[PDB]
Amino acid sequence: DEPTSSTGALTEFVKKMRATARKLTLPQGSRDWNSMAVRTRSYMEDLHL
Amino acid sequence: MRITFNDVKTSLGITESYDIVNAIRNSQGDNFKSYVPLATANNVAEVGAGILINQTVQNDFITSLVDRIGLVVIRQVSLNNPLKKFKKGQIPLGRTIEEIYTDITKEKQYDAEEAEQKVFEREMPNVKTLFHERNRQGFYHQTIQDDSLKTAFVSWGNFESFVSSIINAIYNSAEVDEYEYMKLLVDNYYSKGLFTTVKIDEPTSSTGALTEFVKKMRATARKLTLPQGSRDWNSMAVRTRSYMEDLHLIIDADLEAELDVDVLAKAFNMNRTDFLGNVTVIDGFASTGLEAVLVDKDWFMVYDNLHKMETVRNPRGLYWNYYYHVWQTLSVSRFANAVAFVSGDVPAVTQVIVSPNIAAVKQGGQQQFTAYVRATNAKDHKVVWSVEGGSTGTAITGDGLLSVSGNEDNQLTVKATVDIGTEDKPKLVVGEAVVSIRPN
Amino acid sequence: DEPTSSTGALTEFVKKMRATARKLTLPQGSRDWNSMAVRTRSYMEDLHL
Amino acid sequence: DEPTSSTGALTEFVKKMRATARKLTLPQGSRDWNSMAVRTRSYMEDLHL
């Protein structure tokens, strides 16, 4: 919605980011987060925001 | 036998939302003014994403020569199934596995008068048995034309890395397939309906719903780990008890993030609120309302029977065929406790949150309140602002601006209300904020 | 207004007291805190309430 | 808005100050915080409030 609109939206943005990072860093991997649609995997120490 | 590609456009599967080059060109004081001083911006942007098909290109100085390839990189990945910790041991070749369970008996009245003839009578122990059988039999097949692949590489290291990448891929496919089979086990159990259902609200819609879901899960785990045992938490009911160290809870990333953002952080000494059992994070559930599943370590009865690899060679074709055969048995135990934790439908609007929860304003100052509505649907609803306890002259406008009268000694309660019901029957969702009045 | 009227009045009094102590302790001194209108400065360990 | 009108405005002022300080401290520089626009850079240890 908006990060700076309200605290209720800032916390929602934080929750969404945390969920996205957790599902990005999954042992089984996924192909829903790249333009090649290839089954890949990422790491927490390698992710940059 | 040469394969050539002609006049292939650079942007094959690119659907541009907007032309960045055109925006930079026709930028007048907007956010694109930063790229104006750049001189090679168009050339950078036209091949920044990457080109799928390579075309031979002569260099600038001598048209006869052709530009070469200066670097080759190979990408390798490794995938594992987090549910692998639920695997049991290995049975080499014994088809079918038998599970036994002896139940309790009833109490009898003592009577020596009738205990003279019924000494020899029998009483069956009331035993219950079930069986599991092999149900997974698959193989992965892949060919490698090593002799024909030597033209595409210059050094031997790249060739070896490519072969190792192929092997890694054939392993990763098996890993992901095993993970999907393990998830399909739980999906099948829920479809058959042998789970013990628990009706909850949607934990991701409101904070109160999440807290009540946490309370329900904690109570369920406490009554599961009881010394006396119970028959209410498993199919084909039998008196059994679990252990806290043996219980396992399976949730998803959205629920984990909402729990540890909205609840765990805002709660002091969160050891009294975190999940009791072990927590495992998976990639959602295929069922409609299945949110989290609470089972026991003995619930899974996955065994493996064969994990073999064979290689054959075709001298006429000059290639290798690799086969990876996986034979497994996938089954679950009906004597183990299981809780489904399902939820029903949700309303259009769940809750309204005012950004300043508590505030203090003077006797002449003004305050601004912002309302955030947690609506599941894509529609939007307008809010109505009101003040419950206040004097004359203190009022809130329709935009959320609260003005305080020049003199009052009371606590202000600013409320934002959203009406989702129909006419003649209003249903309201109210978000409150507490405002204090400092003297002037 | 009144120290004991309400919590808001009490905290306003606390803020006023702290600000007055700070501006009394400022090194450059002031002529606005004595009956002789003379430039002088006080000390935190020498101020009594 | 006003530091003294309400407690929320004080927090908003603190947020604005912190954002401004970070923007000043940004390494690549910015020509939007000085009387004559030159691409300049500041340091947190050198910033005084």
UniProtKB/Swiss-Prot annotation, chain B:
Protein name: Major capsid protein
Domain of life (superkingdom): Viruses
Functional summary from the UniProt entry: Assembles to form a prolate capsid shell of about 54 nm in length and 45 nm in width, with a T=3, Q=5 symmetry.
Any one Pfam family match given in the protein's UniProt record, by short name: Big_2
Ranges where the BIG2 domain occurs: 348-427
Stretches assigned to coiled coil: 107-127
Family stated for the protein in its record: Belongs to the phi29likevirus major capsid protein family.
Gene Ontology terms: cellular component: T=3 icosahedral viral capsid; viral procapsid
InterPro entries per the UniProt record, alphabetical: Big_2
Transmembrane segments: none
Keyword tags: Capsid protein, Coiled coil, Late protein, T=3 icosahedral capsid protein, Virion
SMART domains assigned to the protein according to its UniProt record, in alphabetical order: BID_2 (SM00635)
Subunit structure as annotated in this protein's UniProt entry: Homohexamer. Homopentamer. The prolate capsid is composed of pentamers and hexamers of the capsid protein.
Native organism taxonomy: Viruses, Duplodnaviria, Heunggongvirae, Uroviricota, Caudoviricetes
Locations listed in the record: Virion
